[PDB]
Write a protein that binds this ligand. Structure first.
Ligand SMILES: Nc1ncnc2c1ncn2[C@@H]1O[C@H](CSCC[C@H](N)C(=O)O)[C@@H](O)[C@H]1O
Lengths: 61, 118, 235, 58, 25, 72
RNA sequence: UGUCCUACGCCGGCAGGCGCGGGUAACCCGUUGAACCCCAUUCGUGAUGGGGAUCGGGGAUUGCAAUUAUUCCCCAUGAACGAGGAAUUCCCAGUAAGUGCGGGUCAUAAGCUUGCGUUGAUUAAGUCCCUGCCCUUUGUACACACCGCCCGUCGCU
């Protein structure tokens, strides 16, 4: 199910070429859950994302 | 669908290998496409192929009028080699079906290309 | 920049790409002389009828070249649009739709020769999580060594985007029993550098002493034309 | 700069194949004569066939 | 510490890098 | 394949134009040319003739794009 | 930028020809009436009014001399080319790109190289995956080096 969630903290540039951004995300519908995600594109604090599969939390070193 | 092409076919699925051949045939409409006749091609592919495969495949395709044994020669028997030319190289099953014997997988020959995917 | 980066070959090779492929003069000309080089690169004897595989057939202009030389062939491909425009081209041979990396569905001891044109480079990268290029290449190459006649030949044309693709392809080929090598046609050229993996199923002594005395830090005579030179015969 | 680029791209290719060879032996069992000194290209000879390269597979 | 090495090994370095790129009268 | 757009009004084509063009909700040369299989210059001429008889409403005029639509 | 730049008058359809003025120059070309752009007409998916190569005829101009076409003009011919399997170039804002105009080379080219203005963006504000170069630590992995196998069989002088 489509679930929407807001960016609180961008954790940094990840990926081999720096193509992705690791970011800290909290949900609006339940503003208690917190997840870590990888995004493509320019992200600043306050961006709200639409997640198709909001179960797994992404990871890169 | 060329007859030699089906009768060299096997099943590329992992379990039944390499005993997946021969594939069972069925035809709903058959066409004849003109193909050039080099008798050396037929004379070299006749020793290559199992002939009981021809018997079972033609019985699947309703057809009986084939030679029953390996017809080996120096390309001197024009009537025999012409019959195998018509049957193998010219008879095409443009629309048809294929059933895998040892796995049961279904392959529709749909104008005139069978799909053989996962 | 390159077709491989588009994704899986079932999605980059859609109907629009097929219609741009069939109406492309450079594609026709280059892939035609590549089919010529491919058929000339395996030493199948002259005036001898042979049975061939033409995998990565796409349009079948490689198959049209094989049928032009009198030889019959079986086409195998993954994209339906390529097979649709190939049957629209009224090619002589028989086609088949199926992924090559899963395995070629043919009985062993079958084909006199194999020709692959611009297709083996697509098995070097994984576009699905279930996909693994190493095992896929191993399976596809083992399927070649199975379905081919022992002692037949297989030419495998490619444009490797780096040496890692060549490394993995050659390792998976040599671990499937294949014996052969690489014909790199026009190696130092750029517009004609084409990779074809071809496969088949079976006085000094005094100088040293003076350098010793130089390293030891003492005065040494200058090294000249007359360093080691026999002054006279000794009676 | 593009010269050294291309040259040691080729050198990396050769080194990678040469380092492929020993584990290939373990787990299991190039146009230099056609290089033109005057220019980048590929010059034909009469004694030998058209320019090529043979790297055999082990 | 071991906790610091594990956390710093599973996180991403961020921040420091500067790129030098590029009236009244 | 090769289009065979008519260079001039046929009788049936002219009748079908006169009784099917004035109810389309969008009148441009391109749509009449594509769905009547006619050459676009004569499509423009037919649209100008239909405007001249006071039956179709022009919306905007340009050298690049001209658009008409129904009166009501 | 200019003692070859040129205003203007007359002739020829055009290249061009004749005459008469200005300019050693923010003084004259020159309020540099540029092209893209803008506004109307024709065209209608057609290797077609797209594209111009290559040719046939004639005219004009610079040169001692234009043949193997110096250059330009007019009429005719309308080839390949349908967005390039594949190797790669440059680039982060008045920028790329589209578009014209100047300077040097020059009796005549355009054909390089330098500049100028006009219209005006897509992406990006990161990285060390490829390449270059600079560091630091190290010489423990691999390679080298060391040892071992160093191929066997008969046949005559
Ligand atoms: N794994 C795979 N299995 C089968 N076909 C594949 C494949 N990966 C790529 N291909 C095929 O490779 C082709 C590349 S285009 C080749 C066209 C052909 N050489 C010609 O010009 O006649 C496509 O038709 C694509 O479907």
């Amino acid at each position: 199910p489509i679930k929407l969630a807001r960016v609180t903290k961008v954790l940094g540039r990840t990926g081999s070429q720096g193509q992705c951004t690791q970011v800290r995300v909290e949900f609006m519908d339940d503003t208690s859950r917190s997840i870590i995600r990888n995004v493509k594109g320019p992200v600043r604090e306050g961006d709200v994302l639409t997640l198709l599969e909001s179960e797994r939390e992404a990871r890169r070193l | 669908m060329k007859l030699l092409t089906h009768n060299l076919l096997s099943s590329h699925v992992r379990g039944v290998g390499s005993r997946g051949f021969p594939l069972r045939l069925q035809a709903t409409e058959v066409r004849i496409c003109p193909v050039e006749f080099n008798p050396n091609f037929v004379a070299r592919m006749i020793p290559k192929v199992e002939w009981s495969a021809f018997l079972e495949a033609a019985d699947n395709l309703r057809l009986i009028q084939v030679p029953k044994g390996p017809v080996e020669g120096y390309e001197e028997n024009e009537e025999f080699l012409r019959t195998m030319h018509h049957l193998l190289l010219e008879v095409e099953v443009i629309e048809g079906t294929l059933q895998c014997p040892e796995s049961g997988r279904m392959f529709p020959i749909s104008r005139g290309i069978p799909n053989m995917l996962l | 920049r390159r077709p491989e980066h588009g994704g899986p070959p079932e999605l980059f090779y859609d109907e629009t790409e097929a219609r741009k492929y069939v109406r492309n003069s450079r594609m026709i000309d280059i892939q035609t002389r590549m089919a010529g080089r491919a058929l000339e690169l395996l030493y199948l004897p002259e005036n001898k009828p042979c049975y061939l595989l033409d995998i990565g057939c796409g349009t079948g202009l490689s198959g049209s070249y094989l049928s032009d030389e009198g030889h019959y062939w079986v086409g195998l491909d993954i994209s339906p649009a390529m097979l649709d425009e190939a049957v629209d081209r009224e090619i002589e041979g028989d086609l088949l739709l199926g992924d090559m990396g899963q395995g070629i569905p043919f009985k062993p001891g079958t084909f006199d020769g194999c020709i692959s044109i611009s297709a083996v480079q697509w098995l070097c990268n994984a576009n699905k999580k279930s996909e693994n290029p190493a095992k896929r290449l191993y399976c596809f190459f083992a399927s070649l060594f199975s379905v081919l006649v022992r002692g037949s030949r297989a030419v495998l044309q490619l444009y490797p985007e780096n040496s890692e693709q060549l490394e993995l392809i050659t390792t998976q080929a040599t671990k499937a029993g294949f014996s052969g090598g690489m014909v790199v046609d026009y190696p130092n050229s750029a517009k004609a550098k084409k990779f074809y993996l071809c496969l088949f199923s079976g006085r000094a002594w005094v100088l040293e002493k003076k350098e010793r005395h130089r390293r030891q830090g003492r005065e040494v005579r200058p090294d000249t034309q007359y360093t080691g030179r026999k002054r006279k015969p000794r009676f | 700069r593009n010269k050294k680029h291309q040259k040691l791209k080729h050198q990396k290719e050769a080194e990678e194949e040469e380092l492929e060879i020993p584990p290939q032996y373990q787990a299991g069992g190039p146009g230099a004569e056609y290089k033109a000194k005057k220019a980048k290209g590929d010059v034909k000879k009469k004694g030998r066939p058209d320019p090529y390269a043979y790297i055999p597979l082990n | 510490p071991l906790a610091d090495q594990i956390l710093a090994g599973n996180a991403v370095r961020a921040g420091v890098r500067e790129k030098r790129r590029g009236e009244e009268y | 394949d090769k289009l065979n757009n008519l260079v001039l009004f046929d009788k049936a084509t002219y009748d079908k134009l006169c009784k099917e063009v004035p109810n389309y909700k969008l009148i441009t040369p391109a749509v009449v040319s594509e769905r009547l299989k006619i050459r676009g210059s004569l499509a423009r001429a037919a649209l100008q003739e239909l405007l001249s008889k006071g039956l179709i409403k022009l919306v905007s005029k340009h050298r690049a794009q001209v658009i008409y639509t129904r009166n009501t």
